[PDB]
Amino acid sequence: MKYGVYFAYWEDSWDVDFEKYVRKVKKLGLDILEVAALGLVNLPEQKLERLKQLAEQHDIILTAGIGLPKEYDVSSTDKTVRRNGITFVKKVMDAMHQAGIHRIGGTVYSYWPVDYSGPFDKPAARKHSIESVRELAEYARQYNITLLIETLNRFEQFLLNDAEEAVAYVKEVNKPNVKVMLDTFHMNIEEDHIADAIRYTGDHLGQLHIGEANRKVPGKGSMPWTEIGQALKDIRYDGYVVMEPFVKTGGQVGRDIKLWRDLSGNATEEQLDRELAESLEFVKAAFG
Known part of the structure; x- marks a missing residue:
């Protein structure tokens, strides 16, 4: 299994420089950095290439995260919006290719x-979603890109709220480069049992996002880490585990995550580094 973190752990906005996080993640013993697609799509070619070279130099796997805005809703009944969204995601994939990002x-x-x-x-x-995703899956092939379909809580989305809907959706899309992404935060709200949702998803599981119920770093809450560890062993998951902690209120990230109080105790960058290092040791122990 390979472990990573979303850059956003340290930041207040999605559209920032990523280069600093490649060194940092390597320093912390992580395998993966997840960056915001939004911060790639209009990044100059010079900087996309520099990011690719830094990842190669440090032997870090880069992945991309996205939440499409209304204007780029590939599920819209409005054809103009749908097509605008498809074009925007193709543009995101063009940038991903130059930065050496496949997921x-x-x-x-x-x-x-x-x-x-x-x-x-x-x-x-x-x-509309399934047809949009099939077309994007086809465009992705030229870049060996995989789309990870995130299962979200009811408050953030209405399409895929549990593993059952996400698995049914991905089976229907019926593309090898389209997989299910599960997230402890979202599973915690919608599933009867988190370990059983992972077991159910099995071969469809393309990536796991992890954090506590309130999106603190693993170890600070009551998430059943040992059961999750066991469920991952049960499906012989050898894939990516990306920590997605959000503990900072006040910024664009705070607003879109809807965090209306500080959960970091006003932690400095350094303090957030040490806590993430401890969290990683805890999760690896919990996962054997």
Whole structure:
């Protein structure tokens, strides 16, 4: 298994420089850095190449996270919006290729965060989503890119809220480079039992995001880490485990995560480094 962290752990916005995090993640003994697709898509070619070279130099695997905004809703019944979203994701994949990034995960199949103030049509959004994802899966092939379909809690999305819906959705898409991404934060809200959801997903599981129920670093909460560790052994998961802790309130990241109090005790960059190092040791012990 390979362990990583989302750069956003340390930041207040999605669109920042990533180069610093490649060295840092290697220093901390991690295998993977996950960066925001948003911070790649208009990055100059010079900087996409520099990022690729830094990852090679440090032997770090780079992955990309995305939440498509309303304007790029690939699940929209509005054809103009749908096509705008597809074009935007193709552009994201063009940039991914130059940075040497092969995996894109998150809400790449609809928009995030969902706005429930207006009405929606789950059935119609779903079939548009599947056709959009098949087309993006086909475009991805030329770059050996894999799409990771994130299962989200009801408050952030309406399409895929549990492992059952996500597995059914991905089976129907029926593409080898389209897999399910599970997330302890989201599973904690929607599943009867977190370990059983992982077991159910089995061969469909392309990536696991991990954090506590309130998105603190593993070890600070009551997530059943040993059971999760056992479930991953049960499906012989040899894939990527990416820590996705959010403990900072006030920024664009704070607002989109909806964190309205500090959970870091005003932790400095250095303090967040040490806690993540301890968290990683804890998770690896918990996973054997």
